[PDB]
Design a protein around this ligand. Structure first.
Ligand code: HEM
Length: 152
């Protein structure tokens, strides 16, 4: 549950991502895959990438980065009212992709890392606080649907 001030910060930060959605999406996925290689195993179409150079060179990875962040952005722009948007994602990731909630924690922190890396000194403490809360909310609502599905 975020305040309007905090949502304002979130969508302010998001404007950064939107100026270059493919570049951000790419770096988030790379940070995830290199920070936590077990996550790469959940992607049949990226599991071939063994080096970060190959990851960097992958137009299809950038493409998927775009899909992921486009979806996240759509969800964030709802300012918490994202049940319709989130439900199919929770369902596909629990039932088809089989993604444990731990990996959503991983990518949340990865987003935080990328924003500092791409915008050093331009991602203030208040901004980080708001973004972190927003990703926690997202994660928590997925976690609820996972529990419903009995998915571990
Ligand atoms: C911010 C968090 C995430 C968002 C917004 C997101 C969104 C999406 C979307 C929109 C799709 C395509 C439609 C669908 O299959 O439902 C997708 C596919 C997929 N996601 Fe996620 N995702 C997130 C996190 C993750 C994480 C952390 C993993 C694994 C570590 C993951 C694994 C996958 C896989 C394996 C696919 C199918 C890829 C393919 O073969 O096309 N996702 N995701």
């Amino acid at each position: 549950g975020l305040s309007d001030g905090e949502w304002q910060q979130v969508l302010n930060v998001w404007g950064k991502v939107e100026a270059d959605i493919a570049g951000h999406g790419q770096e988030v996925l790379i940070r995830l895959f290199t920070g936590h290689p077990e996550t790469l195993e959940k992607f049949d179409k990226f599991k071939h990438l063994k080096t970060e150079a190959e990851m960097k060179a992958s137009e299809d990875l950038k493409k998927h980065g775009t899909v992921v962040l486009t979806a996240l952005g759509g969800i964030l722009k709802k300012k918490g009212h994202h049940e319709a948007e989130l439900k199919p994602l929770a369902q596909s990731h629990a039932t088809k992709h089989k993604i444990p909630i731990k990996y959503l924690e991983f990518i949340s922190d990865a987003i935080i890392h990328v924003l500092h890396s791409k915008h050093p000194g331009d991602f203030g403490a208040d901004a980080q606080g708001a973004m972190t809360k927003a990703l926690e909310l997202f994660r928590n609502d997925i976690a609820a649907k996972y529990k419903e599905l009995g998915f571990q």
